Structures are given as structure tokens and as C-alpha cells.
Short mmCIF file of C-alpha atoms and ligand atoms in Angstrom, two decimals:
data_model
loop_
_atom_site.label_atom_id
_atom_site.label_comp_id
_atom_site.label_asym_id
_atom_site.label_seq_id
_atom_site.Cartn_x
_atom_site.Cartn_y
_atom_site.Cartn_z
CA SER A 1 15.95 -82.09 93.31
CA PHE A 2 13.74 -80.20 90.54
CA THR A 3 9.98 -81.57 90.74
CA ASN A 4 9.43 -82.01 86.78
CA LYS A 5 6.16 -81.47 85.79
CA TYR A 6 3.04 -80.66 83.46
CA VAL A 7 1.74 -76.98 83.85
CA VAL A 8 -1.42 -76.19 82.77
CA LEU A 9 -0.20 -71.98 82.05
CA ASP A 10 0.01 -70.09 78.94
CA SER A 11 3.20 -70.13 76.97
CA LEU A 12 4.59 -66.62 77.32
CA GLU A 13 3.80 -66.96 81.48
CA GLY A 14 5.31 -69.91 82.04
CA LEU A 15 8.70 -68.83 79.89
CA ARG A 16 8.92 -66.13 81.62
CA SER A 17 8.72 -67.80 85.26
CA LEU A 18 11.97 -69.31 84.42
CA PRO A 19 15.11 -67.82 84.86
CA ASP A 20 18.09 -66.98 82.62
CA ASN A 21 20.26 -69.22 81.47
CA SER A 22 18.50 -72.05 83.33
CA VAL A 23 17.30 -74.88 80.17
CA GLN A 24 20.11 -77.06 78.29
CA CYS A 25 17.40 -78.05 75.67
CA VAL A 26 14.20 -76.93 74.27
CA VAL A 27 11.95 -79.22 71.57
CA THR A 28 8.46 -77.74 70.67
CA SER A 29 6.11 -77.24 67.47
CA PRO A 30 4.12 -74.01 68.18
CA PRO A 31 0.13 -73.84 66.65
CA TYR A 32 0.95 -73.32 62.90
CA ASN A 33 -1.86 -70.98 63.07
CA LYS A 34 -3.49 -72.54 59.57
CA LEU A 35 -6.93 -70.99 60.27
CA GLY A 36 -5.32 -68.01 61.29
CA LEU A 37 -3.31 -67.79 57.75
CA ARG A 38 -6.22 -67.92 55.69
CA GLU A 39 -8.76 -65.27 57.88
CA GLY A 40 -10.56 -67.82 59.65
CA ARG A 41 -11.31 -69.59 56.70
CA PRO A 42 -12.54 -73.23 56.90
CA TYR A 43 -10.77 -76.00 55.34
CA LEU A 44 -10.95 -79.40 55.17
CA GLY A 45 -8.79 -81.69 57.77
CA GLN A 46 -8.69 -78.61 59.65
CA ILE A 47 -7.01 -78.75 63.33
CA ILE A 48 -8.89 -78.18 65.48
CA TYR A 49 -7.48 -78.23 69.40
CA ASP A 50 -9.42 -78.70 72.76
CA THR A 51 -8.54 -75.25 73.84
CA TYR A 52 -7.55 -73.40 70.98
CA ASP A 53 -8.60 -72.56 67.99
CA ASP A 54 -5.77 -71.99 65.79
CA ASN A 55 -7.17 -68.17 64.87
CA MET A 56 -5.03 -65.26 64.85
CA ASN A 57 -4.76 -62.43 62.88
CA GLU A 58 -1.51 -63.90 61.20
CA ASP A 59 0.97 -60.22 62.33
CA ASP A 60 0.29 -60.48 65.56
CA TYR A 61 1.15 -64.49 65.29
CA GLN A 62 4.54 -63.82 64.08
CA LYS A 63 4.73 -61.28 67.02
CA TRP A 64 3.78 -63.53 69.55
CA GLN A 65 6.24 -66.45 68.37
CA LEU A 66 8.92 -64.01 67.91
CA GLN A 67 8.02 -63.21 71.71
CA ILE A 68 8.65 -67.16 72.45
CA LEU A 69 11.34 -66.86 71.09
CA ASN A 70 13.23 -64.12 72.23
CA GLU A 71 12.66 -65.93 75.71
CA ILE A 72 14.13 -68.76 74.81
CA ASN A 73 16.84 -66.93 74.19
CA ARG A 74 16.75 -65.47 77.54
CA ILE A 75 15.99 -68.95 79.04
CA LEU A 76 18.68 -70.88 77.66
CA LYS A 77 22.24 -71.79 78.64
CA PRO A 78 24.95 -70.94 76.64
CA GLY A 79 25.84 -73.61 74.62
CA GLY A 80 22.03 -74.78 74.62
CA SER A 81 20.03 -75.90 71.92
CA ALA A 82 16.63 -74.94 70.98
CA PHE A 83 14.13 -77.65 68.23
CA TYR A 84 11.50 -75.38 67.18
CA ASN A 85 9.19 -77.40 64.60
CA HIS A 86 7.38 -75.39 61.99
CA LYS A 87 6.29 -75.63 58.37
CA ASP A 88 6.05 -73.42 55.10
CA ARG A 89 2.49 -72.75 54.89
CA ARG A 90 0.98 -71.51 51.82
CA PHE A 91 -0.81 -67.57 51.54
CA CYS A 92 -2.47 -66.44 48.63
CA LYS A 93 -0.90 -69.59 46.03
CA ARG A 94 2.48 -68.74 46.67
CA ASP A 95 5.03 -69.88 49.45
CA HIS A 96 4.85 -68.61 53.63
CA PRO A 97 7.78 -69.57 55.13
CA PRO A 98 8.46 -69.78 59.13
CA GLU A 99 12.18 -67.89 58.17
CA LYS A 100 9.93 -64.56 57.13
CA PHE A 101 9.27 -63.85 60.86
CA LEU A 102 12.10 -66.45 62.32
CA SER A 103 14.80 -64.29 61.55
CA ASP A 104 14.39 -61.46 63.32
CA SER A 105 14.05 -64.05 66.84
CA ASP A 106 16.71 -63.34 69.05
CA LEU A 107 18.16 -66.85 68.96
CA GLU A 108 20.96 -67.41 66.23
CA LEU A 109 20.26 -70.76 64.01
CA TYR A 110 23.11 -73.23 63.76
CA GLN A 111 21.21 -75.57 61.22
CA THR A 112 18.08 -76.57 59.43
CA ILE A 113 16.41 -79.97 59.98
CA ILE A 114 14.78 -81.73 57.55
CA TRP A 115 11.74 -83.79 59.05
CA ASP A 116 10.60 -86.32 56.28
CA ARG A 117 7.30 -88.04 56.61
CA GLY A 118 7.30 -89.84 53.85
CA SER A 119 3.37 -88.85 53.16
CA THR A 120 0.79 -85.95 52.91
CA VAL A 121 -3.06 -86.20 52.87
CA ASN A 122 -2.56 -82.58 50.86
CA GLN A 123 -2.40 -83.77 46.98
CA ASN A 124 -3.15 -80.48 45.35
CA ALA A 125 -0.90 -81.56 42.31
CA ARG A 126 -0.31 -77.25 41.80
CA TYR A 127 3.52 -78.00 43.99
CA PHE A 128 5.46 -80.42 44.90
CA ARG A 129 3.80 -83.22 47.78
CA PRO A 130 4.34 -81.19 50.86
CA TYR A 131 5.30 -83.92 53.38
CA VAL A 132 8.12 -81.99 54.52
CA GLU A 133 8.59 -79.85 58.31
CA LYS A 134 11.63 -78.13 59.15
CA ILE A 135 12.96 -78.46 62.76
CA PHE A 136 15.17 -75.02 63.44
CA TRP A 137 18.05 -76.00 65.77
CA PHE A 138 18.85 -73.01 67.31
CA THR A 139 21.22 -71.66 70.33
CA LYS A 140 22.00 -69.05 72.50
CA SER A 141 23.09 -66.02 71.40
CA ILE A 142 25.04 -63.73 74.07
CA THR A 143 29.13 -73.70 68.91
CA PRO A 144 26.20 -75.67 71.12
CA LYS A 145 27.01 -79.63 72.80
CA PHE A 146 25.98 -81.92 70.33
CA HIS A 147 27.46 -85.86 70.36
CA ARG A 148 26.50 -86.93 67.19
CA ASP A 149 27.97 -90.24 68.06
CA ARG A 150 25.18 -91.09 70.50
CA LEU A 151 22.69 -91.50 67.02
CA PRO A 152 22.66 -94.95 64.23
CA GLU A 153 23.89 -93.73 61.44
CA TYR A 154 20.31 -93.26 60.02
CA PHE A 155 19.99 -90.40 62.20
CA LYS A 156 23.22 -88.38 61.75
CA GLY A 157 22.24 -86.82 58.98
CA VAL A 158 20.22 -83.31 57.92
CA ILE A 159 17.39 -85.15 56.99
CA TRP A 160 15.53 -87.50 59.45
CA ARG A 161 12.40 -90.05 57.76
CA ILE A 162 10.03 -90.46 60.82
CA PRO A 163 6.32 -91.54 59.88
CA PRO A 164 3.97 -89.32 61.66
CA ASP A 165 2.73 -91.28 64.76
CA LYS A 166 -1.11 -92.25 64.09
CA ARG A 167 -1.51 -93.65 67.19
CA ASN A 168 -1.71 -90.96 69.20
CA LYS A 169 -5.17 -88.92 69.41
CA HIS A 170 -3.53 -85.50 69.76
CA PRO A 171 -4.42 -83.83 66.65
CA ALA A 172 -1.20 -82.63 65.90
CA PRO A 173 1.67 -84.71 67.58
CA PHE A 174 5.30 -85.17 66.84
CA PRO A 175 6.95 -88.79 67.27
CA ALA A 176 8.78 -89.42 70.41
CA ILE A 177 11.64 -90.51 68.39
CA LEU A 178 11.80 -87.01 67.39
CA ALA A 179 12.45 -85.55 70.62
CA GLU A 180 15.01 -88.36 71.63
CA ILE A 181 17.04 -87.41 68.79
CA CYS A 182 17.19 -83.65 69.90
CA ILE A 183 17.31 -84.39 73.65
CA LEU A 184 20.13 -87.38 73.90
CA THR A 185 22.33 -85.11 71.26
CA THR A 186 22.20 -81.62 73.47
CA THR A 187 22.08 -82.49 76.74
CA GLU A 188 23.41 -85.48 79.81
CA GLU A 189 21.12 -87.25 82.67
CA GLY A 190 19.79 -84.71 84.43
CA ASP A 191 20.01 -81.76 82.49
CA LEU A 192 16.23 -79.66 81.92
CA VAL A 193 14.23 -80.03 78.87
CA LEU A 194 11.66 -77.83 78.08
CA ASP A 195 8.60 -77.84 75.65
CA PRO A 196 6.38 -74.81 76.16
CA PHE A 197 3.92 -76.36 73.85
CA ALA A 198 3.61 -79.55 75.33
CA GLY A 199 0.26 -81.09 74.31
CA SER A 200 0.67 -84.82 74.28
CA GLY A 201 3.73 -84.33 76.04
CA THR A 202 5.54 -86.32 73.81
CA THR A 203 8.97 -84.25 74.92
CA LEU A 204 8.54 -84.78 78.50
CA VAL A 205 7.86 -88.78 77.97
CA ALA A 206 11.20 -88.33 75.49
CA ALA A 207 13.09 -86.82 78.72
CA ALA A 208 11.68 -88.79 81.00
CA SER A 209 12.93 -92.08 79.34
CA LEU A 210 16.11 -90.42 78.73
CA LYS A 211 16.81 -89.70 82.51
CA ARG A 212 16.23 -85.68 81.88
CA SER A 213 14.31 -83.52 83.91
CA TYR A 214 11.44 -81.82 82.02
CA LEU A 215 9.16 -79.14 81.88
CA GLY A 216 6.03 -78.49 79.94
CA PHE A 217 3.73 -76.17 79.18
CA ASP A 218 -0.11 -76.23 77.65
CA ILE A 219 -3.44 -74.32 78.20
CA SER A 220 -5.32 -77.43 77.94
CA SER A 221 -6.12 -79.41 81.07
CA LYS A 222 -6.87 -82.87 78.73
CA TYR A 223 -3.64 -82.73 77.12
CA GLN A 224 -2.29 -82.65 80.64
CA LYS A 225 -4.38 -85.31 81.76
CA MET A 226 -2.81 -87.16 78.16
CA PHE A 227 0.44 -86.61 79.12
CA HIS A 228 -0.09 -88.70 82.71
CA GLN A 229 -1.73 -91.20 81.14
CA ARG A 230 1.18 -92.02 78.33
CA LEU A 231 3.61 -91.52 81.25
CA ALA A 232 1.85 -93.79 83.73
CA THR A 233 2.01 -96.49 80.50
CA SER A 234 5.47 -95.94 79.06
CA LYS A 235 7.83 -98.48 79.98
CA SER A 236 10.57 -96.14 79.91
CA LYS A 237 11.14 -97.59 76.34
CA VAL A 238 13.43 -95.29 74.51
CA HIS A 239 12.97 -95.63 70.26
CA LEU A 240 15.88 -94.56 69.57
CA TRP A 241 17.50 -98.03 70.71
CA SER B 1 13.60 -70.15 14.34
CA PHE B 2 15.35 -69.02 17.55
CA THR B 3 18.83 -70.15 17.63
CA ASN B 4 19.78 -72.34 20.41
CA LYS B 5 23.33 -71.56 21.58
CA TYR B 6 25.41 -71.61 24.45
CA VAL B 7 27.19 -67.95 24.78
CA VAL B 8 29.88 -66.67 26.56
CA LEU B 9 28.81 -64.01 28.72
CA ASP B 10 28.75 -62.59 31.30
CA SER B 11 25.36 -63.86 33.03
CA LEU B 12 23.90 -60.23 33.83
CA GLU B 13 24.97 -59.01 30.43
CA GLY B 14 23.11 -62.05 28.90
CA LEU B 15 19.84 -61.25 31.51
CA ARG B 16 19.93 -57.58 29.95
CA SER B 17 19.70 -59.14 26.23
CA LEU B 18 16.76 -60.30 26.38
CA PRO B 19 13.27 -59.03 26.12
CA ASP B 20 10.68 -59.06 29.15
CA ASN B 21 8.53 -61.90 29.10
CA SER B 22 10.38 -63.89 27.04
CA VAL B 23 11.45 -66.92 28.76
CA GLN B 24 9.37 -70.12 30.06
CA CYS B 25 11.90 -71.88 32.68
CA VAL B 26 14.76 -70.89 33.96
CA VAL B 27 17.00 -73.62 35.59
CA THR B 28 20.39 -72.35 37.43
CA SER B 29 22.81 -72.96 40.09
CA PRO B 30 25.34 -69.74 40.46
CA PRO B 31 28.30 -70.20 41.84
CA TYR B 32 28.08 -70.55 46.08
CA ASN B 33 31.24 -68.07 47.00
CA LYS B 34 32.07 -70.42 49.24
CA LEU B 35 35.51 -68.82 49.29
CA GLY B 36 34.15 -65.24 49.32
CA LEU B 37 32.06 -66.12 52.58
CA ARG B 38 35.69 -67.26 54.11
CA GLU B 39 37.23 -63.61 53.44
CA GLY B 40 39.34 -65.34 50.83
CA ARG B 41 41.10 -68.27 53.42
CA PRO B 42 41.66 -71.46 51.27
CA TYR B 43 39.75 -74.54 52.18
CA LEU B 44 40.45 -78.13 51.63
CA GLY B 45 38.41 -79.59 48.54
CA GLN B 46 37.89 -75.94 47.53
CA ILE B 47 35.78 -74.80 44.50
CA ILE B 48 37.74 -73.12 41.88
CA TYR B 49 36.79 -72.49 38.47
CA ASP B 50 38.09 -72.50 34.78
CA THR B 51 38.08 -68.41 34.92
CA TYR B 52 36.54 -67.58 37.97
CA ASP B 53 37.88 -67.62 41.96
CA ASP B 54 34.56 -67.84 43.88
CA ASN B 55 36.33 -64.98 46.32
CA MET B 56 33.66 -61.97 46.39
CA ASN B 57 32.68 -59.81 49.54
CA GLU B 58 29.39 -61.45 50.92
CA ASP B 59 27.49 -58.30 50.62
CA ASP B 60 28.33 -57.81 46.85
CA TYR B 61 27.69 -61.17 45.96
CA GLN B 62 24.04 -61.02 47.40
CA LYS B 63 23.40 -57.71 46.16
CA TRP B 64 24.73 -59.80 42.32
CA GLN B 65 22.43 -62.38 42.90
CA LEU B 66 19.63 -60.06 43.81
CA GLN B 67 19.90 -58.04 41.01
CA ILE B 68 20.38 -61.44 38.77
CA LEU B 69 17.02 -63.00 40.34
CA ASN B 70 15.49 -59.34 39.47
CA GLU B 71 16.38 -60.11 35.56
CA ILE B 72 14.28 -62.85 35.65
CA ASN B 73 11.76 -61.94 37.19
CA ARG B 74 11.52 -59.08 34.05
CA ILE B 75 12.34 -62.19 31.75
CA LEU B 76 9.99 -64.71 32.55
CA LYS B 77 6.69 -65.19 30.87
CA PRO B 78 3.70 -65.15 32.99
CA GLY B 79 3.31 -68.40 34.72
CA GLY B 80 6.72 -69.25 33.46
CA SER B 81 9.44 -70.40 36.75
CA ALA B 82 13.21 -70.35 37.51
CA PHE B 83 14.46 -72.87 39.84
CA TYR B 84 17.18 -71.19 41.74
CA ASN B 85 19.76 -74.07 43.09
CA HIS B 86 21.33 -73.15 46.40
CA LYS B 87 22.33 -74.27 49.40
CA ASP B 88 23.30 -73.27 53.54
CA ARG B 89 26.27 -72.54 53.97
CA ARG B 90 28.39 -71.73 57.51
CA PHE B 91 29.16 -68.61 58.41
CA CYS B 92 31.60 -67.96 62.13
CA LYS B 93 29.65 -70.78 63.76
CA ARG B 94 26.60 -70.15 62.25
CA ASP B 95 23.57 -71.46 59.58
CA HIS B 96 24.15 -68.53 56.84
CA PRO B 97 21.13 -69.79 54.20
CA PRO B 98 20.70 -68.63 51.03
CA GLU B 99 16.81 -66.98 52.13
CA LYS B 100 18.82 -64.25 53.96
CA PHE B 101 18.92 -62.53 50.37
CA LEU B 102 16.56 -64.38 48.19
CA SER B 103 13.62 -62.62 50.16
CA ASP B 104 14.58 -58.99 49.09
CA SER B 105 13.87 -60.01 44.66
CA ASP B 106 11.43 -59.67 42.81
CA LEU B 107 10.73 -63.02 42.41
CA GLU B 108 7.46 -64.62 44.03
CA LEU B 109 8.89 -67.53 45.98
CA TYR B 110 6.38 -70.60 44.91
CA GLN B 111 7.73 -73.75 46.86
CA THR B 112 11.23 -74.63 48.41
CA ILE B 113 12.37 -78.14 47.13
CA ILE B 114 14.94 -80.56 48.62
CA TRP B 115 17.82 -82.09 46.75
CA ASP B 116 18.76 -84.72 49.27
CA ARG B 117 22.16 -85.37 47.49
CA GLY B 118 22.46 -89.05 50.30
CA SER B 119 26.08 -87.92 51.06
CA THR B 120 28.66 -84.95 52.25
CA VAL B 121 32.31 -85.20 51.88
CA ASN B 122 31.91 -82.97 55.20
CA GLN B 123 31.63 -85.07 58.04
CA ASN B 124 32.32 -82.53 60.59
CA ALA B 125 30.61 -84.13 63.63
CA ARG B 126 29.49 -80.50 64.98
CA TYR B 127 26.47 -81.11 62.84
CA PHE B 128 24.12 -83.40 60.85
CA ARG B 129 25.64 -84.67 57.62
CA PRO B 130 24.83 -81.65 55.34
CA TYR B 131 23.73 -83.43 51.98
CA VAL B 132 20.78 -81.20 51.25
CA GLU B 133 20.82 -78.56 48.62
CA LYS B 134 17.65 -76.57 47.76
CA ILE B 135 15.96 -75.41 44.82
CA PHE B 136 13.79 -72.46 45.14
CA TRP B 137 10.99 -73.04 42.46
CA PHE B 138 10.38 -69.36 42.09
CA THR B 139 7.48 -67.57 39.20
CA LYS B 140 6.94 -63.92 38.27
CA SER B 141 5.69 -60.90 39.63
CA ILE B 142 3.38 -58.68 38.16
CA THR B 143 -0.27 -70.40 39.56
CA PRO B 144 3.05 -71.36 37.25
CA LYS B 145 2.22 -73.73 34.76
CA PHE B 146 2.96 -77.18 36.21
CA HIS B 147 2.12 -80.76 34.93
CA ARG B 148 3.09 -82.85 37.56
CA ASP B 149 1.04 -86.14 35.79
CA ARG B 150 4.29 -86.14 33.36
CA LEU B 151 6.94 -87.81 36.59
CA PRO B 152 6.97 -90.48 38.02
CA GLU B 153 6.44 -91.22 40.93
CA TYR B 154 9.46 -90.78 43.10
CA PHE B 155 9.95 -87.17 41.65
CA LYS B 156 5.98 -85.76 42.86
CA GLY B 157 7.22 -84.65 46.22
CA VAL B 158 9.23 -82.28 47.27
CA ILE B 159 12.68 -83.99 48.23
CA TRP B 160 14.03 -85.53 45.27
CA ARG B 161 16.71 -88.14 45.91
CA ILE B 162 18.99 -87.67 43.11
CA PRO B 163 22.76 -88.62 43.47
CA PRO B 164 25.65 -86.08 42.26
CA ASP B 165 27.57 -86.42 38.73
CA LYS B 166 30.21 -87.59 39.62
CA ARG B 167 31.51 -88.18 36.17
CA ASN B 168 31.15 -84.48 35.00
CA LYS B 169 34.26 -83.40 34.94
CA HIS B 170 33.27 -79.48 35.54
CA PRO B 171 33.78 -78.59 39.51
CA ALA B 172 30.45 -78.30 40.47
CA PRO B 173 27.46 -79.30 38.48
CA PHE B 174 24.24 -80.98 38.84
CA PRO B 175 22.69 -84.08 37.30
CA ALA B 176 20.82 -83.98 34.03
CA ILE B 177 17.87 -85.34 36.05
CA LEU B 178 17.31 -82.43 38.08
CA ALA B 179 17.01 -80.11 35.12
CA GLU B 180 14.52 -82.62 33.51
CA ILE B 181 12.22 -82.59 36.11
CA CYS B 182 12.17 -78.67 36.33
CA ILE B 183 11.99 -78.45 32.41
CA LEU B 184 9.33 -81.28 31.60
CA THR B 185 6.79 -80.04 34.27
CA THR B 186 6.87 -76.24 32.94
CA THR B 187 7.01 -76.12 29.49
CA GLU B 188 6.00 -77.05 26.28
CA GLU B 189 8.08 -78.34 23.17
CA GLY B 190 10.04 -75.71 21.47
CA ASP B 191 9.51 -73.43 24.62
CA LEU B 192 12.85 -71.69 26.03
CA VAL B 193 14.61 -72.63 28.36
CA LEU B 194 17.69 -70.60 30.34
CA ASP B 195 20.50 -71.33 31.95
CA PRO B 196 22.76 -68.09 33.52
CA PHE B 197 25.55 -70.26 34.83
CA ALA B 198 25.67 -72.50 31.85
CA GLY B 199 28.34 -74.50 33.20
CA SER B 200 28.66 -77.84 31.90
CA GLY B 201 25.44 -76.91 29.85
CA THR B 202 23.64 -79.48 32.05
CA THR B 203 20.15 -77.51 31.52
CA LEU B 204 21.06 -77.44 27.85
CA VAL B 205 21.65 -81.21 27.38
CA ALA B 206 17.96 -82.06 29.02
CA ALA B 207 16.57 -79.03 27.23
CA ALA B 208 17.84 -80.46 23.48
CA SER B 209 16.86 -83.77 24.87
CA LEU B 210 13.04 -82.48 26.21
CA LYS B 211 12.96 -81.01 22.17
CA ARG B 212 12.74 -77.26 24.17
CA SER B 213 14.82 -74.16 22.82
CA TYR B 214 17.55 -73.35 25.23
CA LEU B 215 20.32 -70.39 26.10
CA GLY B 216 22.75 -70.42 28.26
CA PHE B 217 25.81 -68.52 29.51
CA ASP B 218 28.66 -68.75 31.18
CA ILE B 219 32.31 -67.24 30.81
CA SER B 220 34.09 -70.18 30.50
CA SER B 221 34.78 -71.03 26.85
CA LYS B 222 36.45 -74.11 28.29
CA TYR B 223 32.66 -74.69 29.49
CA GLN B 224 31.08 -74.15 26.77
CA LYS B 225 33.62 -76.64 24.61
CA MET B 226 32.41 -79.26 27.73
CA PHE B 227 28.90 -78.67 26.80
CA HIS B 228 29.45 -79.06 22.90
CA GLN B 229 31.18 -81.84 23.43
CA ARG B 230 28.75 -83.12 25.42
CA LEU B 231 25.46 -82.55 23.81
CA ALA B 232 27.38 -84.22 20.49
CA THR B 233 27.69 -87.68 21.93
CA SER B 234 24.21 -86.71 23.54
CA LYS B 235 22.00 -89.55 22.12
CA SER B 236 18.89 -87.35 22.92
CA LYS B 237 18.68 -89.62 26.34
CA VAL B 238 15.66 -88.54 28.49
CA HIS B 239 17.18 -89.96 32.34
CA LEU B 240 13.41 -89.66 33.50
CA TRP B 241 12.12 -91.96 31.35
N1 SFG C 1 -0.69 -70.03 74.37
C1 SFG C 1 -0.43 -71.40 74.87
N2 SFG C 1 0.35 -71.70 75.70
C2 SFG C 1 0.66 -73.06 75.79
N3 SFG C 1 0.02 -73.82 74.89
C3 SFG C 1 -0.69 -73.32 73.41
C4 SFG C 1 -0.85 -71.93 73.79
N4 SFG C 1 -1.74 -72.01 72.52
C5 SFG C 1 -2.10 -73.64 72.11
N5 SFG C 1 -1.38 -74.42 73.10
C6 SFG C 1 -1.10 -75.31 72.70
O1 SFG C 1 -0.03 -75.69 72.00
C7 SFG C 1 0.48 -77.38 71.50
C8 SFG C 1 0.21 -77.60 69.83
C9 SFG C 1 0.93 -78.82 69.83
N6 SFG C 1 0.27 -79.07 68.00
C10 SFG C 1 1.98 -79.28 70.04
C11 SFG C 1 2.19 -80.81 70.21
C12 SFG C 1 2.98 -81.76 70.81
N7 SFG C 1 3.89 -81.72 69.75
C13 SFG C 1 2.69 -83.44 70.96
O2 SFG C 1 3.69 -83.81 70.56
O3 SFG C 1 1.66 -83.33 71.35
C14 SFG C 1 -1.42 -77.61 71.61
O4 SFG C 1 -1.35 -78.18 72.27
C15 SFG C 1 -2.29 -76.32 71.85
O5 SFG C 1 -3.10 -76.82 73.29
N1 SFG C 2 29.46 -63.38 35.95
C1 SFG C 2 29.54 -64.27 35.64
N2 SFG C 2 28.74 -64.91 34.27
C2 SFG C 2 28.38 -66.41 33.80
N3 SFG C 2 29.03 -66.92 34.68
C3 SFG C 2 29.88 -67.27 34.99
C4 SFG C 2 29.75 -65.84 36.24
N4 SFG C 2 30.73 -66.14 37.41
C5 SFG C 2 30.85 -67.80 37.09
N5 SFG C 2 29.92 -67.87 36.75
C6 SFG C 2 30.03 -69.72 36.14
O1 SFG C 2 29.07 -70.23 37.11
C7 SFG C 2 29.00 -71.25 36.56
C8 SFG C 2 28.43 -72.25 38.38
C9 SFG C 2 28.33 -73.44 37.98
N6 SFG C 2 28.07 -74.38 39.35
C10 SFG C 2 27.38 -74.03 37.60
C11 SFG C 2 27.20 -75.62 36.62
C12 SFG C 2 26.01 -76.24 36.16
N7 SFG C 2 25.00 -76.08 37.12
C13 SFG C 2 26.35 -77.46 36.30
O2 SFG C 2 25.57 -78.57 35.71
O3 SFG C 2 27.17 -77.49 34.68
C14 SFG C 2 30.30 -71.67 36.84
O4 SFG C 2 30.67 -72.81 35.28
C15 SFG C 2 30.93 -70.44 36.65
O5 SFG C 2 32.20 -70.58 35.53
#
């Protein structure tokens, strides 16, 4: 059977190692290029990854993310789903939303989900408190498989109220229950779940607890070890249940 | 002093009657072209306005809304704000978001606000329950005036939890408190508030209760009369307070 694994590898190199039409569900949150959007100007609370400075020319960052999304479109099975978590950023005192580059991809946007994180450290009073991230639910372009009946009532809507995972030592993770919602509704046991920016391995832990197959890529061997330790101490608990 | 009024007039004709740089705050929700997006195919729960069928060729609808937004950019004062309420629609089983046309306007998007309506009559289980509308906060292009300190804690964030106004006889209105948040934070007493799709006059009632000047346009004399009756029975109550 397929060997589930977290591979230390560049995300595009990993995606290009997968055949067409081979992944049922992708759940992922890329680096957000906050430092790079600022042209390298430091800021308080700056996200610094183990082996990545998050400081790419913004136009090049957008082209890179488009290549990622286009590879995801290739590797998705017909009827599969890709959940891409991003957030509105700020550029020159104006909104800088992900939609400005997402719309050019081969993937077809099925629905935008709102992740309500409840609170944010950013209390700048020049705008409303920005505690929302977006989860773009894409499907392949050539309705997706979706079983909303599997969810509790409080996750059947387009706003998901999930607090950030403050106990996770990774600098910018998402909670396990977020990945669980995506996986449970769009896959069957044994189906392949992929996270090409696996980080602390949240998507893979969720897939494992739900008895789905899993594959993750990240460039940090420290984060791979973080996943392995987390998997070992996971009692296969599903946080939804 | 300026004569506050609800005028029965086409929205573009009304906007083009205003000089440049003359309006501090716009709050508006246009017809959403749900029937027109469907190419005129009827649907249950169809919105039918008094004098408007909501059935425009979708490309022409988008060009029209762009003309509206471009006129708003012209008539806004520097530092003013326009709050444009729209919603993701569905086309051919895929997402059809307003951003696909909003991005071409002369207005500069400052922030997207999420209006959480709590529930929706649309219980189609092929997607998550779509009870969110968006409020696009734009400013003029050549930070906007904004006093978040005037709001209660529960409206300082990017999600506003406001139930729909089910007692309003207009077929598709928004609640008074929505307009109050926008007006209170971006204007001073006496400043001009405009709604070019005034409907039941919600924006104008809110402006009047806050002692702002107001101007509204709509094509229905029935809705103008609806506003006049509503204003007369309004005890100048501010729902926020
Ligand atoms: N070229 C790249 N290929 C693969 N991973 C990368 C690359 N550049 C950055 N990363 C990783 O992208 C990840 C982004 C994280 N925010 C993801 C965290 C993850 N959602 C979690 O729950 O832990 C980081 O762990 C980076 O190490
Ligand atoms: N060309 C037009 N010019 C002005 N108003 C129009 C035009 N076409 C449609 N309308 C109006 O657009 C309005 C859209 C409404 N959904 C607005 C309701 C409003 N937000 C309220 O709270 O009552 C309707 O009242 C229509 O009569």
C-alpha cells in the first residue's frame, strides 16, 4: 500500500513528483510573504521560519503561488478538493487580498470559507480588527465530493469559529480541527490527503486520525521531526468528535 | 442648508448630478442580479422589486456596477468612505464573487468586512451554508477618516453579527445598525451620507438619527413613500445605543 510520509523537499518539486489525477484532498497554508510584501522592512511579531525568511519579491511570490495552484489542479482527482488558507494583507495603507493572484490559476474556486480566529494581536485602530483568514475551497478544472452530513451543526456554515492553536511551537500553524473538517467531508478512508507546506504536520495528523493516507512536503527537517514527535504522541484522537 | 431628501431617480443619473469631492460617506447595496446571472431562469424565493426585475445580462450588470463605483470615486471627498454591500453568487456550480468586477474600479479597497447574517434559507448541502455577505470598505483614489472608538466592543472587529431585518417590508433590505456603524465611524454631524440604491431608506434613517445630512436615490416611488412613513415614525433612535 501507499507509504504515508512527511518528506523534506521543496513544495513545487514535491508536487511535480506526483502523477496527474492522484490526490483527493489538499489542505494547505503557504508562507504569507508578510516581510516580502513590506520589501524587507522588519516588523514586530515577525514570522521567522526555521529555514525560510518569508521575504520574497511580492510579484515573484504571486507567480510562485500560481505555479503551486496550477500543479495542484493537475494532481487533483476529478471531484477532489483543495483547501488553500490565506489572508488579506496590507500594502501602502490599502487592502492586499489573495484574490488578486488566486483568480489566474487553473483551479476553479468553489466557495470561500471564513476562518474566524476570534482575536488578533493587531489592534491598529485605523481599520476593523483583522482576525479573519480565508479558506479557499477549490476544485479541479478539466460538484466536488462533499458530505456535509458528517459535520456537527456548528461547522455546517461558511464561518468556522476555531481559536488559533497557541500550544503548537511552530511559528504559524493552523488547528487540527480545521484540517479535519476539510478531510472528513471530501474523502473516504484510504484516500490520499496532501499538504505541500506541511509545517508542524497538522494536516497529516488529522489525516492519520481519520485513517486517510497522507503526504506532506516542507523544507525544514526540524518541522519534519516536530511532526514525527506529534504523531507518536497522538492517540489518534479526532478533535471534531 | 442642504436639503435632505430621497429622490426618485436612476442611480447613475443621481450620482452624475453631484459635484466632485462632495460626499463624506456612501452606504449602499445594489440589486444583486440573481435572476440575470441565471439568464432569466426563475428560482424559488426570487427577489422581485417594485419596478425592477433584477434580470440584466451579467456582463452588462458588471459594467453598470463599475460605472456606479467610478462615479462614487469621483464624488467622494478625499478621506471619505464608501461601504458597498454585495455577496458571493453561484454560476455554473462555481463561485461567482463580486471581486471579479470590483477590482477594476477607480475606488481603492481599504478592507473587506464580513456581515454574518447567522442563517440562510439556502440549505443546499453541496456547499457550506452561505449566510455571509461582504461589505467592501472603499476609499477615494486621487487613510480614511475612521473613529473606531465610537463603536461598542462587539462591532470593532471585521465580522459584524447582525441578524437580517425581517420586519422590513422591502424585499431585500439591510438593518439600520449596519448603516449606523458605517456612518458613525466615518463622519461628523452635518456631513453628507449618500445611498444611491436607497430602497426602504435604511441608510437615510440611520443618517437622520445620527444628525448627518442625507441623500438617497431609487427608481420606485413606492419605496420613497416607504421611507417617508418610516422616517415619520422613527423616534430618532440609534440602534447601536
Ligand atoms: N519552498 C517551500 N517548500 C516547502 N515548504 C516550504 C517552502 N517555503 C516555505 N515552506 C514552509 O511553509 C510552511 C508554512 C507554514 N505556515 C505551514 C504551517 C502548517 N499549516 C501547520 O499547521 O503547521 C513553513 O513550515 C515553511 O517551512
Ligand atoms: N437604476 C436604479 N437606480 C436606482 N435604484 C435602483 C435602480 N435599479 C434598482 N434600484 C433599486 O435598488 C434597490 C436595491 C435594494 N436591495 C436596496 C435596499 C436597501 N439597502 C434597504 O435597506 O432598503 C431596490 O430598492 C431597487 O428599487
